[PDB]
Design a binder for this molecule. Sequence first.
Ligand code: GTP
Ligand code: GDP
Ligand code: MG
Ligand code: MG
Lengths: 430, 86, 1133, 184
Amino acid sequence: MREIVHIQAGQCGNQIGAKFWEVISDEHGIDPTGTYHGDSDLQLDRISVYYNEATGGKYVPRAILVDLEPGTMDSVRSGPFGQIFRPDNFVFGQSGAGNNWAKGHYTEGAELVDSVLDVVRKEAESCDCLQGFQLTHSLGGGTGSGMGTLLISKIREEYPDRIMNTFSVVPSPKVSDTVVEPYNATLSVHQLVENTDETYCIDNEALYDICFRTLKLTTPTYGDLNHLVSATMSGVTTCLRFPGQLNADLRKLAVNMVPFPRLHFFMPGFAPLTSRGSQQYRALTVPELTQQVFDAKNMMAACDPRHGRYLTVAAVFRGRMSMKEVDEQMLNVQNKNSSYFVEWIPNNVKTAVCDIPPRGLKMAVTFIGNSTAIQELFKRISEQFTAMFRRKAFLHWYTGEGMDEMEFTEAESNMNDLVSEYQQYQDATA
Amino acid sequence: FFVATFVRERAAVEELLERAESVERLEEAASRLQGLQKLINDSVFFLAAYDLRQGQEALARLQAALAERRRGLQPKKRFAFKTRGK
Amino acid sequence: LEAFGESAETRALLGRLREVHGGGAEREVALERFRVIMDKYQEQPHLLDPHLEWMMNLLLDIVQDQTSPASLVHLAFKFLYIITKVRGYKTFLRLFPHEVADVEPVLDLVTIQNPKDHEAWETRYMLLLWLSVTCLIPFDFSRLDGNLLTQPGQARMSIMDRILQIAESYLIVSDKARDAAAVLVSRFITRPDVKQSKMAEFLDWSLCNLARSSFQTMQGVITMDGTLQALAQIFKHGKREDCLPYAATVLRCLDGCRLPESNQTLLRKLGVKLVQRLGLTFLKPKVAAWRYQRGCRSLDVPEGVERVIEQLLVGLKDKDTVVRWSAAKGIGRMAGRLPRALADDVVGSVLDCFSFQETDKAWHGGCLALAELGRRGLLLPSRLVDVVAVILKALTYDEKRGACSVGTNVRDAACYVCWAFARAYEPQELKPFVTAISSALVIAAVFDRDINCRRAASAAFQENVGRQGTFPHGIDILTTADYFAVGNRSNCFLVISVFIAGFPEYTQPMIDHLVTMKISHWDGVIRELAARALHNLAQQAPEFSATQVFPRLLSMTLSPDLHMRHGSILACAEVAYALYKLAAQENRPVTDHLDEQAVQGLKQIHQQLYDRQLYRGLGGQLMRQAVCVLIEKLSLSKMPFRGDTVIDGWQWLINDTLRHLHLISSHSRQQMKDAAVSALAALCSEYYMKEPGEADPAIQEELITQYLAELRNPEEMTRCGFSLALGALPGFLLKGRLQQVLTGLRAVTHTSPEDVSFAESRRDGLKAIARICQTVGVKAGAPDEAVCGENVSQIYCALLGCMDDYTTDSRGDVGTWVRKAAMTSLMDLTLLLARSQPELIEAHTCERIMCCVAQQASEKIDRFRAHAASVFLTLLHFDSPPIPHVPHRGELEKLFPRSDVASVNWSAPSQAFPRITQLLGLPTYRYHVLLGLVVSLGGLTESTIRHSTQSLFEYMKGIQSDPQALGSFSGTLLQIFEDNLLNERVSVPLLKTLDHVLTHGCFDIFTTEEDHPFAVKLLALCKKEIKNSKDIQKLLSGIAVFCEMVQFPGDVRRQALLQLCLLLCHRFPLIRKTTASQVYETLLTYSDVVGADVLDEVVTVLSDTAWDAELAVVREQRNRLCDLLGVPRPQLV
Amino acid sequence: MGLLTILKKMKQKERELRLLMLGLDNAGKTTILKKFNGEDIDTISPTLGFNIKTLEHRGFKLNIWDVGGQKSLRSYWRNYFESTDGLIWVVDSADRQRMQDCQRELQSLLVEERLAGATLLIFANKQDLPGALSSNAIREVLELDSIRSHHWCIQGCSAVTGENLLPGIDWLLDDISSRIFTAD
Ligand SMILES: Nc1nc2c(ncn2[C@@H]2O[C@H](COP(=O)(O)OP(=O)(O)OP(=O)(O)O)[C@@H](O)[C@H]2O)c(=O)[nH]1
Ligand SMILES: Nc1nc2c(ncn2[C@@H]2O[C@H](COP(=O)(O)OP(=O)(O)O)[C@@H](O)[C@H]2O)c(=O)[nH]1
Ligand SMILES: [Mg+2]
Ligand SMILES: [Mg+2]
C-alpha cells in the first residue's frame, strides 16, 4: 500500500480536484512542467504516494478526470496546470445528466462506467500496491452524484479490500437555485453509509456564511468556494503527503477516525481563514490557533461542535513551532472543554506537528472531527426531502428512468435511522 | 482448508501449464480455471476481502499465462484473402 | 422544456459585457449565470437554433470593434466557446461570417495571441475555428495577397504561408487549441491552391515529427497526437487521388511508431483511425444498390489492404472499449467498399473472435464488427446459421468473476446486431430465424437486470416489427412494451411478462428461460423476481407448470449448488401456490394438478435437507428460510399432509429456527423470525384442527406448555421468538387457555431486577399481546376465549406499565423501542373496542393513555416524536366510531384540523414543536406536555432547543401578564421538579429550563413580592437536588438557577446568597471560578442586593481573590466576603 | 457507445440534410434561394464566393449552400461535395449559346465520387421569357436520358414570380425519404 488513485466527477468535483492538485504541486515544488524545484527532502520522501515516476525524472499525476459533458473537461485541461495530467485520463460524454440522479446513475453513467473502469484499472496496474481511493464529487449535482456513487459501488464490487474515501460537497439553497437537489442529496447518503468508508462533510451554507460574514464579501463566487475547499483538502491530507507516525496510510486513518461502520462523516476545519489576494503579516500564536480551530465559525459544516459530543478528533499544526507547547495547549483544551468529549473512548484526541506550513502562511492548523453534531447537516436535508416528496413534485423525472418511490422510501429510512443512531450514541449512558 | 485447496489447485494448474504442449493439455487446463472460478464465486458469502483479492489476482495471472501459452503454441497466421485457395 | 424562455435575461447579460470586463467582481457572476442558463439546454441544443444566430451577431460586433479592449474581446470569446460547447461547433461555426473581406482581419487577430496565456485560451481556440470557416471561399490566397513586394527589402508573408506556420505551431500545444488546428488542417491543406504548394511540405514535416517523437515524454506524445489528428483529417476531408500517392509512405511511418504496444489508449485510437482512412484511399467508394427497396429514411486490391485488415483484426482484441469500437467502425467502412466475394473473407475472421467464451473483449469486438457489417448490408445468407447462433448466446452473457459480474457490454452489442439485422437481410432470407430471434429479444426486454440492455432489446424489437413485420404479435408487444413501460423492472417481470406470455408463441421459451437461468441467478432479488414472474405466469399454463416445469424443479432442488437449490425450492413453492389458487376457482382440490409424483417430492424437500445437515452455517440459513417459505405455502394451499411425520418434522425445524436466532446475522435476523412465525400461523391453521373451531387436545397442550415455558428462557432472542410464536397461534387453539397465554406475555413485557437490559423482549411481547387481542376479538362472557370485561382492565394495566420505561444502556434509550411498541398496542386496542364494545373503554384509563401519548409526542427524538403524533392523530380524529372519553376533544379538534393534518411534517422540529406546545392550554395534558417540553429543552441539539424555546416564549407571552395563569403553570413546573428529583433524566433538563426562563424574564410579577411561596419551595428543591453531586453540568446548571433566583427579594435572597457563598468553595477550582463569575455577574446586573455602601469592597475582594488557589487560602476570603454581606459563616468539622 | 446513444445520434443526423445549389453564373440561384425563403428580390447582388442558409421544411432541417457559378469558382466546387444529399442544378433557359458549356458542366458533376449517392433536381429558371427554351429542349440539349446513376427530374420555374418552386423541394424530400439513411 503506497499508491492512491484520484478521481473527480461532476463540474464541482473536477474543479475541487484540479485545485487540490495545484495546491499539492505548489507545496511540493512540482512546477506545471512536472520537474521538482522545491527546497526540502521531505517533499520527495513521500512523492510516490500521489505521483508516478516517468522518464527524465518526471512526476506524472495519478488522477482520472471523469464527466458526462465536455465543458469542465476542457476547463481543467486548459488551466494553468492542465498540461500536468494524462491526455487519456479524461473520460466524458456530450449530453450530461440534467440534475437527475437517475440519468447519471442508470443511463449515461451506466454506459460510461465501462470506460471509467478502464482508466481506473490502468492506474491500479501502475501501482506496486494500491492503498485506497480518493474521489471528489458533490451530492447536489446529478452527474456529480449519480455516476460518482456508481463508481464507488463498482470499485467496492471489484477491488475487495481497499479503503474508500470521498469529499462529498453538500449543496445549499443559498448558492444554487435548483429544486431537485434535496432528492439528489438524500439518495447519495443512502449509498455512502452502505458503500464509502470515510466521507468529509463540506456544507455549502457554512462556506457562504464564512465568506459573506467573516471575510466580508458582497457577492461570494464559486472562486471563493474552491479557495476554501482546496485548503481544507490540503490540510486534511497533509499526513499522507509527508512523513508521519499518526496517520501515514489510509487504513490507519480509517481505523482511528471510524468508530462504527455507518458513522464515518467527518466535518473538517482550517485556520487561519484567508481569501484570494490577501496576505496576513500577523502570525497567530499556538494558543490562538488552537482556540480558533475549534471555533464553530472555522468549521466547513453548518454544525456547532458545542451542541454535541466528540468521538474522534485529529489536529495537525503546520509551521515552525515547539511540540511541548502544542501538547500543553491540547491537554488544556481537553481538560477545560471536557464536557464536549465522550468518556467511553479513552485517548480520542490526537495531535500532530509538521515542518511544512502551507504557502503564504507561516502558521496553519487543521481539524478532522467525528462529533455527533454532524447529524444536524442531515436533519435539514430531511425536512426539504419530506416536504417535496409528500405532494409528488418533479417525481416523473425519476420514475420515468427506472427508479421508483421504493428507493426514495429506502434512502429516507436509512438516513432517518442514521440520525437516530447518532442521537443515541450522543446520549450513551445518559 | 479453502486457502489450502486453492493453493494446491493453483500449483497443480501451474505445473500442468509449465508442461503444456497439446490443445488437450491447454483445454483441460482451461477447465480447472472454470472450476476454480465457480468455487470462488460460490464461497464469497463467508470469505474475507484480502483472500478474495489474492484469489482474483491469482486467477488473473493464471488466465494471462494461459493466454500467452495459447498464443505461443498456436501462432495464428496473418490475414489473407481466400483468392486462389487451391 | 419546449422553447427558450430566458430571452430577455440572456439579452441583458450579453449587453452587460461592456460594463463587467475591467473588474472581475461582476465578471465571474455573469459567466456563472450564463453557464447555468445554458446548461439547461445541454440535452436539447436543437431548441437554441432559433436564438444562436442573433446571439452570435451581438458577440461578433463586440470582438470586431477596434476600440474593444483585450479584456472585452476575451470575454466575448468565452461566451462564444460556451455557446459552441452547448449547441455544437459543427452547427455553430457554419453560420459564422465566411466572406472574403473577413480573411485578412481574422488572421491578423490570430497573430496577436500569446500561447502562454492560460487565462485567455478560449480566445486562441474559437478564433482558430473561425479561420477554418474562411477557407471555404472559392478564390485563391494569391489573389487576396496581391503584390507582396511593396516594401523595400523585407518582403510581406503571404496568407498561405502564415496559415501554414500557425497550423504547424498549434498542432503541438497541450491546450484545446491543438484540436482547433486539426479543423484548419482539414480546411487549409485540402484547398486546391494550398494542396499544390503545401501538401509535400506538410507531409514531409509530419513524417519527420512522427519519426523523431517518443511516447515516453510529455511533449513527443502531444506532437504525435497532433500529427495523427492532422493526417486523419487530411485523409478524411481530402481527395482519394491526391492522397493515394502518399498512403503507402504514411502506413509505413504509422507501423514504425510501434503504437499497438504503447500504454497510451488515445494514440492507439488515432493510429487505428489513420489506418482505416489510409485503407479507404486504396479502394473507390461503392453505393448500396440495395436501397430504395428495403425501408424508408424514418420509421483488383492493393497489398496494403491485407496489412490494414490484419491491424484492424489485431485491434479488435483490445482491452479498451474505445479502441474496439474504432476498429469495428474501420472494419465496417472497409467492408462497405469491397467485392461481394472478398468481403466474406473478413467475416470468417470475425467469427474467430468467438472461440473462447472467457474472452469477453473478443466477443464484444466480434459483435460490434458483425453489427457494423450488417448495418451496411455486407453479410451473405450463408453466414446466418453461424452468426445468428452466436448472437443467441450473446443475448444471455452474464458471468461472475468473484465479486464483479460481466456481460453487460456483450448483451448490449447483441441487441445492436439484432437491430442491424432488420436491414442487413431481406424478409424472405430471414424467415427460418424469425421465431428464434423474436423470442430471444422478448426474454432480454422483460428479464434483463440492466435497464440499458432492456431498452436496447426493446428498440431492436421495435425495429424488427417496423421494418419486417414478421414477428408474431409485433404491434401488441410493441404498444405495451415501449421506452416508458419497459423502464420498470418489476412491471417487466410481473405485468408485461404475463401480457407477452398470453400468446402460445411465448409461453414455453419464457418459462424455460425463467426456470433454467433467472431462477438460478447470483442475486436473491433477481431470484425472488423470477419466482414471482413464474407464479404470475403459472395461471396462463397450468398443464405446462404442473407436468414439465414442476418435475424439472424437483430434480434441481437436490443439486449441490446452494443458490440453485434455493431457486428451485422457491419455484416449486410458487408453482404449488399458483396451482392451488387455480383449483380453488373450480371447486376442485389441488391434488388433481399435483400428481402423486409432485406430492412425494414436496413431502421430501425438508426431510432430505436435514439428512445432509444442510441447515448448518450461513449457507444453511438460506435453506432454512426456503424451507420455512415452502412450509408456509404448502400449509396455506391446504395440502393432504394431516397426520404424517412431515408435519412433526416441520414443527421441529420452526422450533429450532427460533431456539437459535441468536446464531442468525443481526442484519438478516428480524427477517428469519418474521418468516418462521408466518409459516407457524399457516401450518397450525390447516393441520391442527380436529373439528370446525377446535383442535387436537394433545397438540394444544404440548405447544402452549412448550412456548409459555420458553418465555422465561435466559436467552433474549429465544424469548422474542417464542413471544411472536405465541401471538400467531389460531383462535381455535387459544380457546380454553387464553388467560394462561395472557399471564405469560404480561411477565414477558415486565422488567425484573435481572431483566433490566431485556428491552427487545418487551417489544415482541407487546407486539404479540395486541396480536392475540385482534385474533380472539371481543366477546361478552368469555375470559378464556375472547376479550370480555373480565380481562380488559389487566391488559390496559400491563400496556400502561411499559410507558414509564426509559433505559439509558451503553447504546442509549433502548427503552424507546419498548415505549414505541406499547404505543402501537394501545392504538390497536382502544380502536378495536371502538368498533365493537366501546363501553369497555374506561374514562380514567383513556385519559391516562391520551396523557402518555401527548407526553411521548414531545421527546427529543424526531423519529419517535413523529410516531407519537401520528398515533395521537389516529386516536383523536377517529370518528368510525369516535373514542368515548378524550379530555378536551373539541379543543383538540380545533387545534388539529383533520384537513390540515396530512400535510404536517411532525418529524421536523420546526413543523412539530410550535403545534405540540399549544396543548399546554388544557389543564389535563398541561403537566404531561410541560414534562415533555422540559426533557426536550435540556437536550443538546441546537435546532431542537431553539425551536422549543421559541415556542415556549411565544406561548408564555399570553400568560405572563395574567397572574393566575403564571400561578398555575409555575405550580405545575414546581410539581414536575418534586415529581422528578434525583431521577437524573428530568432533573438536569429541568434546571436548564428554569435557568433559561429566569434569564428571559418571565417570572417578573412575582419578584415584587417578598418571600413568594414559589421561590421558597424552588430554593428547597434546588438545595435537595444540587447537594451531593459530581458531574459538572449539574453543578453549573444549579449555580445558574441560584444566581437567577437571587433576584427574588426577602429571606430567599439571603438564603440564595449563602448557598452561592457555600458553592464558591467547591471541591473543583473550575466550579469555584464559575460560581465567582456568576456571583459577580448577578451582583453587577441586579440592584439593591447589597447595601451599606459595602458593594465596592465586595467586588474588589472578589476580583482580587484568586479562586484557583488552595482551600486554606480561600476560606479566609470566603469568610470575609460572608461577613461583609451579613451572612452567617458556615462551620468546619 | 451503447445502442440508445447510437440511435439518438442516428435520429439527430436523419433530421438534417444538405442541398448544394450549383449552376452557371447569371442563372438565378441567389434569386431562387431568396424567393424560397420570402426575402426581397429587388436587393440581390451576385455572390462573391458562396452563401449559406438554414431553414425548416416539413420538419426537415434544410441547409442550402449557394455557390457562385463564375469561371474561377468552379475549380473550388469540390470543397462543397462532402456530405451532399441533394444537388439543385439551375439552368437558364434564355442562355442558349452557352448551353453546350452548361451540358459539359452538369455531365462532369455526375462522375464524382462523393456525389454518387445523391438526388438531382434540375430547375429550368427564366421560363417566362420570350426566347426561353422549353423543358424538352433543355432535357434534350443536356442529354438527361443518358443519366442512370442518379434520380433526376427536370422542372421549370420562375423566381421572379415564385412558381413551381415548392413542387421541386417536395419531390426532392420525397426522393430523399425513399432511401435508407445510415450513419458512417
Ligand atoms: N463549492 C462548489 N460547489 C459547486 C461548484 N460547481 C457546482 N457546485 C454545486 O454543485 C451542485 C450542482 O452540481 P454540478 O457539479 O453542477 O453537477 P454535475 O456533476 O455537473 O452534474 P450535471 O449538472 O447533472 O451534469 C450545486 O449545489 C452547486 O452549487 C463549485 O465549483 N464549487
Ligand atoms: N427574367 C428573370 N430574371 C431572373 C429570374 N430569376 C433570376 N433572375 C435575374 O437574373 C439575374 C442573375 O440572378 P442571380 O441570383 O444573381 O443569379 P446567380 O448569382 O447566378 O446565382 C438577377 O438579376 C436576377 O434578378 C427569372 O425567373 N426571370
Ligand atoms: Mg455539469
Ligand atoms: Mg448568386
